[PDB]
Amino acid sequence: GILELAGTVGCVGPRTPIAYMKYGCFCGLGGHGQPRDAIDWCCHGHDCCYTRAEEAGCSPKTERYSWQCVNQSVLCGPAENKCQELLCKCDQEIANCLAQTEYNLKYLFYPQFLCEPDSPKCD
Ligand SMILES: [Ca+2]
């Protein structure tokens, strides 16, 4: 769920999870266009991951799941079902991805109007 998402992103660092609430063309509810940068790419991959989970019959934005933060690293589990495995994997992946990026203030609250209609394919 969103609580775990914010949690994992905050565990790995280096900035507040709120910094990605609405950024570029993909960080924030929905999203389309050409990713603006590395961070926007992480959100693109995350959206893709969430779509895959939804197709797997899960609820990425609501179901909670257990996990641990150790030395700024996310450890997933224990999982009670396959969905908790999937969700934690998505969040763990965007957290790691996001952790390796530089922040571009110019994309904070970027107008979706400036984002293209089409989007790159999902892996
Ligand atoms: Ca999004």
mmCIF file of C-alpha atoms and ligand atoms in Angstrom:
data_model
loop_
_atom_site.group_PDB
_atom_site.id
_atom_site.type_symbol
_atom_site.label_atom_id
_atom_site.label_comp_id
_atom_site.label_asym_id
_atom_site.label_seq_id
_atom_site.Cartn_x
_atom_site.Cartn_y
_atom_site.Cartn_z
ATOM 1 C CA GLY A 1 0.000 0.000 0.000
ATOM 2 C CA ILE A 2 0.894 3.695 -0.119
ATOM 3 C CA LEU A 3 2.088 3.487 3.463
ATOM 4 C CA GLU A 4 4.597 0.751 2.583
ATOM 5 C CA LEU A 5 5.551 2.583 -0.612
ATOM 6 C CA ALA A 6 6.419 5.737 1.302
ATOM 7 C CA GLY A 7 8.131 3.594 3.892
ATOM 8 C CA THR A 8 10.428 1.681 1.549
ATOM 9 C CA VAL A 9 11.355 4.816 -0.394
ATOM 10 C CA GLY A 10 12.176 6.533 2.896
ATOM 11 C CA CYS A 11 14.200 3.556 4.117
ATOM 12 C CA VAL A 12 16.610 3.637 1.178
ATOM 13 C CA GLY A 13 17.115 7.418 1.103
ATOM 14 C CA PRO A 14 18.472 9.983 0.271
ATOM 15 C CA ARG A 15 15.485 12.357 0.308
ATOM 16 C CA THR A 16 11.940 12.599 1.681
ATOM 17 C CA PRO A 17 9.372 10.329 -0.045
ATOM 18 C CA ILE A 18 7.205 13.423 -0.484
ATOM 19 C CA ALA A 19 9.753 14.676 -3.008
ATOM 20 C CA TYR A 20 8.292 12.253 -5.551
ATOM 21 C CA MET A 21 4.599 12.738 -4.750
ATOM 22 C CA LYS A 22 4.159 14.678 -8.013
ATOM 23 C CA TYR A 23 7.240 14.862 -10.242
ATOM 24 C CA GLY A 24 7.926 14.648 -13.980
ATOM 25 C CA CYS A 25 5.485 12.823 -16.244
ATOM 26 C CA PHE A 26 5.132 9.670 -14.179
ATOM 27 C CA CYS A 27 5.526 10.245 -10.464
ATOM 28 C CA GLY A 28 1.991 10.646 -9.123
ATOM 29 C CA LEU A 29 -1.424 9.159 -9.964
ATOM 30 C CA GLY A 30 -1.380 7.860 -13.544
ATOM 31 C CA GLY A 31 1.085 9.286 -16.045
ATOM 32 C CA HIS A 32 1.986 9.500 -19.732
ATOM 33 C CA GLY A 33 4.598 10.844 -22.131
ATOM 34 C CA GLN A 34 8.361 10.655 -22.327
ATOM 35 C CA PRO A 35 10.132 10.225 -18.962
ATOM 36 C CA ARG A 36 11.927 13.467 -18.063
ATOM 37 C CA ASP A 37 14.867 11.905 -16.222
ATOM 38 C CA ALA A 38 16.134 8.972 -14.124
ATOM 39 C CA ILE A 39 13.617 9.597 -11.349
ATOM 40 C CA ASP A 40 10.747 9.827 -13.826
ATOM 41 C CA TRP A 41 12.021 6.525 -15.275
ATOM 42 C CA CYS A 42 11.821 4.863 -11.884
ATOM 43 C CA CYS A 43 8.191 5.937 -11.599
ATOM 44 C CA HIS A 44 7.533 4.665 -15.119
ATOM 45 C CA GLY A 45 8.839 1.225 -14.235
ATOM 46 C CA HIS A 46 6.893 1.313 -10.984
ATOM 47 C CA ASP A 47 3.626 2.090 -12.790
ATOM 48 C CA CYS A 48 4.331 -0.811 -15.109
ATOM 49 C CA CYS A 49 4.997 -3.078 -12.123
ATOM 50 C CA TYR A 50 1.732 -2.008 -10.471
ATOM 51 C CA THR A 51 -0.200 -2.695 -13.684
ATOM 52 C CA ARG A 52 1.255 -6.208 -13.769
ATOM 53 C CA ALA A 53 0.200 -6.797 -10.166
ATOM 54 C CA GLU A 54 -3.312 -5.538 -10.912
ATOM 55 C CA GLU A 55 -3.484 -8.016 -13.790
ATOM 56 C CA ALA A 56 -2.306 -10.686 -11.344
ATOM 57 C CA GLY A 57 -5.434 -9.918 -9.337
ATOM 58 C CA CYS A 58 -3.926 -7.659 -6.668
ATOM 59 C CA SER A 59 -4.508 -4.187 -5.214
ATOM 60 C CA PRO A 60 -1.088 -2.367 -5.258
ATOM 61 C CA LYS A 61 -2.411 0.841 -3.707
ATOM 62 C CA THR A 62 -4.294 -0.644 -0.769
ATOM 63 C CA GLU A 63 -3.108 -3.986 0.593
ATOM 64 C CA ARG A 64 -0.547 -3.797 3.366
ATOM 65 C CA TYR A 65 2.475 -6.084 3.649
ATOM 66 C CA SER A 66 5.275 -6.788 6.117
ATOM 67 C CA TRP A 67 8.880 -5.731 5.509
ATOM 68 C CA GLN A 68 12.088 -4.602 7.256
ATOM 69 C CA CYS A 69 14.533 -1.714 6.806
ATOM 70 C CA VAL A 70 18.130 -2.754 7.533
ATOM 71 C CA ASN A 71 21.143 -0.520 6.824
ATOM 72 C CA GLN A 72 18.865 1.446 4.482
ATOM 73 C CA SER A 73 17.944 -1.748 2.650
ATOM 74 C CA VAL A 74 14.477 -3.199 2.164
ATOM 75 C CA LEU A 75 13.856 -6.850 3.057
ATOM 76 C CA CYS A 76 10.494 -8.225 1.914
ATOM 77 C CA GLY A 77 8.362 -10.486 4.108
ATOM 78 C CA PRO A 78 6.808 -12.385 5.707
ATOM 79 C CA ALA A 79 4.228 -12.641 2.873
ATOM 80 C CA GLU A 80 0.761 -14.078 3.543
ATOM 81 C CA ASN A 81 -0.080 -14.389 -0.162
ATOM 82 C CA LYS A 82 1.389 -13.916 -3.646
ATOM 83 C CA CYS A 83 0.122 -10.329 -3.825
ATOM 84 C CA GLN A 84 2.138 -9.157 -0.820
ATOM 85 C CA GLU A 85 5.197 -10.633 -2.565
ATOM 86 C CA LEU A 86 4.444 -8.717 -5.761
ATOM 87 C CA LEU A 87 3.690 -5.381 -4.076
ATOM 88 C CA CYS A 88 6.794 -5.373 -1.910
ATOM 89 C CA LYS A 89 8.845 -6.290 -4.983
ATOM 90 C CA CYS A 90 7.517 -3.277 -6.897
ATOM 91 C CA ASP A 91 8.068 -0.865 -4.039
ATOM 92 C CA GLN A 92 11.480 -2.341 -3.238
ATOM 93 C CA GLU A 93 12.416 -1.879 -6.885
ATOM 94 C CA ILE A 94 11.415 1.792 -7.178
ATOM 95 C CA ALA A 95 13.081 2.494 -3.810
ATOM 96 C CA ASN A 96 16.423 1.093 -5.022
ATOM 97 C CA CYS A 97 16.028 2.807 -8.416
ATOM 98 C CA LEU A 98 15.115 6.131 -6.833
ATOM 99 C CA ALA A 99 17.992 5.877 -4.364
ATOM 100 C CA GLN A 100 20.580 6.132 -7.170
ATOM 101 C CA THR A 101 19.280 9.359 -8.701
ATOM 102 C CA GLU A 102 20.008 13.086 -8.676
ATOM 103 C CA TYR A 103 17.053 15.424 -8.070
ATOM 104 C CA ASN A 104 15.878 18.000 -10.616
ATOM 105 C CA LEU A 105 13.735 20.723 -9.018
ATOM 106 C CA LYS A 106 12.600 21.892 -12.470
ATOM 107 C CA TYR A 107 10.432 18.767 -12.730
ATOM 108 C CA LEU A 108 8.728 19.089 -9.357
ATOM 109 C CA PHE A 109 5.014 19.582 -10.119
ATOM 110 C CA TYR A 110 5.648 19.370 -13.861
ATOM 111 C CA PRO A 111 2.402 20.102 -15.829
ATOM 112 C CA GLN A 112 1.055 16.935 -17.439
ATOM 113 C CA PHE A 113 -0.009 19.260 -20.253
ATOM 114 C CA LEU A 114 3.654 19.257 -21.258
ATOM 115 C CA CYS A 115 3.772 15.457 -21.238
ATOM 116 C CA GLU A 116 3.344 13.615 -24.528
ATOM 117 C CA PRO A 117 0.246 11.463 -25.261
ATOM 118 C CA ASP A 118 2.283 8.290 -25.813
ATOM 119 C CA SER A 119 4.491 6.368 -23.389
ATOM 120 C CA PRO A 120 7.421 3.935 -23.754
ATOM 121 C CA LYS A 121 6.516 0.246 -23.538
ATOM 122 C CA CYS A 122 6.560 -1.649 -20.260
ATOM 123 C CA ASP A 123 9.130 -4.406 -19.693
HETATM 124 CA CA CA B 1 2.454 7.097 -11.772
#
